[PDB]
Write a protein that binds this ligand. Structure first.
Ligand SMILES: CC(=O)O[C@H]1C(=O)[C@@]2(C)[C@H]([C@H](OC(=O)c3ccccc3)[C@]3(O)C[C@H](OC(=O)[C@H](O)[C@@H](NC(=O)c4ccccc4)c4ccccc4)C(C)=C1C3(C)C)[C@]1(OC(C)=O)CO[C@@H]1C[C@@H]2O
Ligand SMILES: Nc1nc2c(ncn2[C@@H]2O[C@H](COP(=O)(O)OP(=O)(O)OP(=O)(O)O)[C@@H](O)[C@H]2O)c(=O)[nH]1
Ligand SMILES: Nc1nc2c(ncn2[C@@H]2O[C@H](COP(=O)(O)OP(=O)(O)O)[C@@H](O)[C@H]2O)c(=O)[nH]1
Ligand SMILES: Nc1ncnc2c1ncn2[C@@H]1O[C@H](COP(=O)(O)OP(=O)(O)O)[C@@H](O)[C@H]1O
Ligand SMILES: [Mg+2]
Ligand SMILES: [Mg+2]
Ligand SMILES: [Zn+2]
Lengths: 426, 291, 412
């Protein structure tokens, strides 16, 4: 099987560097080097993310889409930056304006064809394609607009292969941009109707989880990114490993989406202990479920405790008892019968790889489909209206060839999306 | 919320030994095919006339439409089983009276009731028709200037509605749409009832052949998912699962009406296609629960 | 004389590798000896690959190892219809190519995992295409039906109410081994909270060895495969008996091993030892096939059983005077060199049809409804060449399996 990553925008891009920083080491691939793999198993399934050309050069099969040179020229001028074949860099030296409209209708719409071109060169690579990984932020141009287009096109070209989306939904407390809800509401819209698996991460849900669950005092972006990339590795790549009970994107999809919206999840990693001290090793297993299922530790902003779950997928990856795994999951399902929805006898989807995260003994990625994420699109949707009402920075959109009915559309859509999700919380 | 009513009817096409059996003792809503027993809301043998079928299945929806509820009547099934014939997709002018289908009959009763209530009228009512075609999961406006151009983010509402004042006008839109019409092609002719404060639709859907040889079927299919999602209140409806459910999104809402018309062949050679069509009816029948 | 076997689904393949292991182990045929007599099917390469990479690597022909690099999908539909279809031909070909090479066979021991994609769906049509190509044989399918509370897949029931209805009208005798109810045995009758799947497999890998292996093997009271279905199914429904083993004692902890027949047989009817969460909560047995192996005196049995026949609290069906097929083999069991199985010199792999499953099916059917009641993951099948029909019409199916398993019992 296979997949083809997609680094839309700067963020989605910045993260690319971290997702690939990791993944590679979790596959023994040095900058341009080959497979130094401490083992021999980190190779029989690599294909999922690379391509064979030389014999020591397995190049990441991702796409780097962005209308701001400097960015990709920071990712390509640093560490692992020199492993991507230049063909991968689909830049847009234009003005990468922070407008969803500027990267979806006017500026991005041009650079698109020169992207799809490659997304096809990579898809028609070899063997059988599974789906595409998509990273980006719903709070900017090259991210929400142009990346949200990249998919609307992808999903027309292969409505068969899957589409996981890793979105950095606009954090609450403080917005790292101003129109944010504009660029956001507009991209979520596109998401709820193309990709079929979305993993929403919040820069501040991370800080928290990174400053209190990792006594880490100076959580640089690199970190946040790093933590995130840690989860997306547990998801995909991982399951493309052996296991007593293994799954793969689809299983994950076909066990997690009760209703076609596409629904968004909230990823959570397992061993998340501070370096030295904490290295408690309390990782027998009840310790991992202890972790994963708590409020804090959910990369999302919202707290599960604020709304039932529809599905859950503990994708563990480290030798354990299909008994102490299958078992724990249960008590968990009974101690919290309250929030776990009922019309699904077994919400949880236990998954079990074998080999764990390179240096760790036992981990377990968590992919939750809780109704709690209602209380986020609400947020976003609110911010919109409060500012849409006055058409705040709307001239930067319309003036870019947009529509007063376009914004209406998205909000509503994504706004209805909130509605539905409640239809199950009850 | 839930739809006001989801109904399923089956109509046996004319025989050219029928595989379709109507039990000597039954409620008139049952049939047996290949030893399988099927139960719906209406089971019409090949002898049922257009008038009877319309009166039993569609006429009741006319009042609902006038009251402001969205209505959809959809024909599905194997090619050559009478879908177009039943829905009345052929221009009325070139059709004998007794063979006139659902579209012309419905429009007739709509005008009559509108003219009878235009004096104890609150507001004025105007009638229109739109003709949309879905070719390979792509919406096309057959009454616009670009009938061969795909639609996007607007096929749901933004599409030409031509005025209707008499059967002649219906004949025009059907003839016009048919000419501008181009391996599956679904047709959706909608009779729009518009007032200053209300807009109700009567969607007459004529799907392409369901026979085989995303997956040809998928609309209706997608339709069942929508019906279920609404019942269980998934607080996200899979409208975008298909172009069909996207175009009919405004009509697939609470206290809307949905009526399925399964057309089946009485021929042994079509047994497999017939069974597929009837099994789908049973599924839609179960999804209609809680409504 | 023989009995081919088709291990379908990752699980049916893991269990397969296991049952297949125990085999050579008690037949003195190391890694590289003769030639198996089965096949391996899966729509996820990486798993069958485990049989291509791991142990018992060269004991198979890359011909009896079928794979569909494509996608597994934990959904019946896709595995049965859409995808699973493409492979079937090829699959069959082997069970027609392997079925020919032999000499007057008896049937195909099928190994699948009820609630899976490749295991539920696929087989559904595999067994399906068999019942027609060899109606004149035995179709005993050995299943691992859905843990009563510890299921895995979110949809599981969808996949198991569908593998039951499609296979029902095609199997001869369906053996059942409950994944969870086996854990209990690993906790309560062996002590270990560290049971790897690789263990449950060693277990069924045992109970199964008692079925084919040893039975098709000479003895003082041989029992052919046909024998089963005959002495085991009272009615055409591909009736599902339950597998049970007796000396499930730990090869470390306790040691009373020397547990004469009189004991090991009583240890079969206590509900805490039956590889199935179908505790005889009321289910009246209606036929049991006590397969013994090792040093056993026929009188010991034709007495140990007599004592049972008169315990009454073990209530057998009415319409059944005597329902005890005593199968005696010679060669004692053969435990893994150093797993965790005791290693006695006699065992009792008793299987049976019990009005008990009236439960297990019930509890699994109900599940289904809850979700179907909301269509839950329905769009996943529809979009895979299925319809409201197949579900609703396979639900009605089992319905008459809840009435069937009710009527054939509880009444006189
Ligand atoms: C001596 C020793 O055992 O060191 C550990 C360690 O101290 C701890 C604290 C690690 C450490 O992780 C962090 O401090 C961290 C920093 C930024 C963001 C997130 C986490 C570690 O850096 C991370 C590193 O993780 C791995 O090696 C995994 O394979 C992981 N790899 C990466 O994230 C990675 C990092 C740099 C370069 C390339 C990859 C992984 C996880 C999931 C999927 C794929 C890969 C491990 C075990 C450790 C150190 C090295 C200190 C922990 O994290 C992980 C992801 O394992 C933090 O809590 C856990 C518990 C570990 O015990
Ligand atoms: N006893 C036993 N049960 C197993 C084993 N592997 C899986 N199972 C059980 O069988 C079911 C899992 O089926 P899956 O592995 O998801 O799927 P599959 O049937 O192989 O086919 P796909 O869904 O297409 O992958 C669960 O109920 C597991 O508890 C095993 O090795 N032994
Ligand atoms: N986790 C994370 N968030 C980022 C990174 N870079 C920008 N962001 C977030 O992305 C949003 C800004 O969008 P940006 O990526 O600049 O848009 P674009 O570059 O025009 O497509 C803010 O909410 C930031 O917190 C990053 O490297 N990691
Ligand atoms: N109930 C009927 N009475 C008389 N003729 C019919 C009947 N149903 C079908 N026909 C005729 O059969 C042919 C095919 O009907 P049609 O509706 O075009 O099948 P479909 O649209 O399903 O492919 C047309 O001549 C139609 O007039
Ligand atoms: Mg037609
Ligand atoms: Mg599998
Ligand atoms: Zn002793």
């Amino acid at each position: 099987r296979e997949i083809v990553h997609i680094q839309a925008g700067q963020c989605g891009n910045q993260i690319g560097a971290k997702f690939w920083e990791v993944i590679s080491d979790e596959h023994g691939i040095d900058p341009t080097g080959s497979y130094h793999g401490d083992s021999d198993l980190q190779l029989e399934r690599i294909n999922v993310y690379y391509n064979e050309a030389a014999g020591n050069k397995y190049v990441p099969r991702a796409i780097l889409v962005d209308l701001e040179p400097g960015t990709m020229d920071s990712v390509r001028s640093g560490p692992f930056g020199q492993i991507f074949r230049p063909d991968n860099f689909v830049f847009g030296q234009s003005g990468a304006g922070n407008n969803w409209a500027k990267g979806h209708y006017t500026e991005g719409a041009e650079l698109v064809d020169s992207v799809l071109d490659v997304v096809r060169k990579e898809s028609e690579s070899c063997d059988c394609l599974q789906g595409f990984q998509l990273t980006h932020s719903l709070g900017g141009g090259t991210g929400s607009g142009m990346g949200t287009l990249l998919i609307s096109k992808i999903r027309e070209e292969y409505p068969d292969r899957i589409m996981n989306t890793f979105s950095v939904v606009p954090s609450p407390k403080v917005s790292d941009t101003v129109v944010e809800p504009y660029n956001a509401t507009l991209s979520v819209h596109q998401l709820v109707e193309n990709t079929d698996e979305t993993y929403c991460i919040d820069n501040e849900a991370l800080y928290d989880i990174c400053f209190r669950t990792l006594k880490l005092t100076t959580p640089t972006y690199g970190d946040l990114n790093h933590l995130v990339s840690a989860t997306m590795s547990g998801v995909t790549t991982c399951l493309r490993f052996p296991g007593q009970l293994n799954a793969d994107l689809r299983k994950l999809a076909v066990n997690m989406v009760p209703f076609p919206r596409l629904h968004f999840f909230m990823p959570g990693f397992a061993p998340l202990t501070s370096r030295g001290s904490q290295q408690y090793r309390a990782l027998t297993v009840p310790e991992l479920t202890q972790q994963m299922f708590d409020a804090k530790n959910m990369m999302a902003a919202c707290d599960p405790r604020h709304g039932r779950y529809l599905t859950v997928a503990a994708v563990f990856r480290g030798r354990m008892s299909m008994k102490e795994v299958d078992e724990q999951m249960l008590n968990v399902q009974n101690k919290n019968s309250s929030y776990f929805v009922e019309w699904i006898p077994n919400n949880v989807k236990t998954a079990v790889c074998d080999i764990p995260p390179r240096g760790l003994k036992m981990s377990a990625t968590f992919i939750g489909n809780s109704t709690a994420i209602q209380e986020l699109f609400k947020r976003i949707s609110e911010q919109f209206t409060a500012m849409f009402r006055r058409k705040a920075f709307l001239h930067w959109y319309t003036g870019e060839g947009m529509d007063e009915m376009e914004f209406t559309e998205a909000e509503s859509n994504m706004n209805d999306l909130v509605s539905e999700y409640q239809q199950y919380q009850d | 919320a839930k739809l006001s009513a989801v109904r399923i009817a089956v109509r046996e096409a004319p025989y050219r030994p029928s595989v379709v059996q109507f039990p000597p003792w039954s409620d008139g809503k049952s049939l047996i095919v290949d030893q399988n027993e099927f139960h719906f809301d209406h089971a019409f043998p090949a002898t049922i006339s257009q008038d009877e079928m319309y009166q039993a299945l569609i006429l009741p929806l006319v009042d609902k439409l006038l009251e402001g509820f969205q209505c959809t009547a959809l024909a599905y099934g194997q090619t050559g089983t009478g879908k177009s014939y039943s829905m009345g997709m052929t221009p009325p002018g070139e059709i004998l009276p007794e063979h006139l289908g659902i579209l012309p009959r419905a429009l007739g009763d709509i005008f009559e009731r509108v003219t009878a209530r235009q004096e104890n009228n609150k507001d004025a009512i105007q009638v229109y028709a739109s003709f949309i075609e879905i070719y390979n999961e792509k919406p096309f406006d057959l009454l616009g200037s670009t009938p061969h151009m795909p639609m996007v983010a607007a096929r749901c509402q933004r599409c030409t509605c031509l005025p209707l004042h008499s059967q002649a006008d219906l004949h025009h839109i059907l003839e016009l749409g048919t000419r501008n019409r181009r391996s599956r092609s679904h047709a959706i002719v909608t009779i729009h009832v518009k007032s200053k404060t209300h807009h109700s639709r009567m969607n007459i859907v004529d799907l392409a052949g369901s026979e085989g040889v995303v997956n040809i079927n998928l609309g209706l299919l997608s339709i069942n998912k929508v019906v279920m999602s609404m019942a269980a209140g998934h607080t996200v409806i899979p409208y975008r699962d298909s172009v069909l459910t996207t175009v009919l999104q405004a009509s697939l809402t609470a206290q809307s009406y949905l009526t399925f018309l399964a057309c089946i062949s009485p021929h042994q050679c079509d047994l497999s296609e017939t069974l597929s069509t009837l099994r789908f009816g049973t599924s839609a029948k179960a999804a209609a629960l809680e409504h | 004389r023989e009995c081919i076997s088709i291990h379908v689904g990752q699980a049916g393949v893991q269990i397969g590798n296991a049952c297949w292991e125990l085999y050579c182990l008690e037949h003195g045929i190391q890694p590289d000896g003769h030639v198996p007599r089965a096949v391996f099917v899966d729509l996820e390469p990486t798993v069958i690959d485990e049989v291509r990479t791991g142990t018992y690597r060269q004991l198979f022909h890359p011909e009896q190892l079928i794979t569909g690099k494509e996608d597994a999908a934990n959904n019946y539909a896709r595995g049965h219809y859409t995808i699973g279809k493409e492979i079937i031909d090829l699959v069959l070909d082997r069970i027609r190519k392997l079925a020919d090479q032999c000499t007057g066979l008896q049937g195909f021991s099928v190994f699948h995992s009820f609630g899976g994609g490749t295991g539920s769906g696929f087989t559904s049509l595999l067994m399906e295409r068999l019942s027609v190509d060899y109606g004149k044989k035995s179709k005993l399918e050995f299943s691992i039906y859905p843990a009563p509370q510890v299921s895995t897949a979110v949809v599981e029931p969808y996949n198991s109410i569908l593998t039951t209805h499609t296979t029902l009208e095609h199997s001869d005798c369906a053996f059942m081994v409950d994944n969870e109810a086996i854990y209990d045995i690993c906790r309560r009758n062996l002590d270990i909270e560290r049971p790897t799947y690789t263990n449950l497999n060693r277990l069924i890998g045992q109970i199964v060895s008692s079925i084919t292996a040893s039975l098709r093997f000479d003895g003082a009271l041989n029992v052919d495969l046909t024998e089963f279905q005959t002495n085991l199914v009272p009615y055409p429904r591909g009736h599902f008996p339950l597998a049970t083993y007796a000396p499930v004692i730990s090869a470390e902890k306790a040691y009373h091993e020397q547990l004469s027949v009189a004991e090991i047989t009583n240890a079969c009817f206590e509900p805490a030892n039956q590889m199935v969460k179908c505790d005889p909560r009321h289910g009246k047995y209606m036929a049991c096939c006590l397969l013994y192996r090792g040093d056993v005196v026929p009188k010991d049995v034709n007495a140990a059983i007599a004592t049972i026949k008169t315990k009454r609290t073990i209530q057998f069906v009415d319409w059944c005077p005597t329902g005890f097929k005593v199968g005696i083999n010679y060669e004692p069991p053969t435990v893994v060199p150093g797993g965790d199985l005791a290693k006695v010199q006699r065992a009792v792999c008793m299987l049976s049809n019990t009005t008990a499953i009236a439960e297990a099916w019930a509890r699994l059917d109900h599940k289904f409804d809850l979700m179907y009641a909301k269509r839950a993951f329905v769009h996943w099948y529809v979009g895979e060449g299925m319809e409201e029909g197949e579900f609703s019409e396979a639900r009605e199916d089992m319905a008459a399996l809840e009435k069937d398993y009710e009527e054939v019992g509880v009444d006189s």
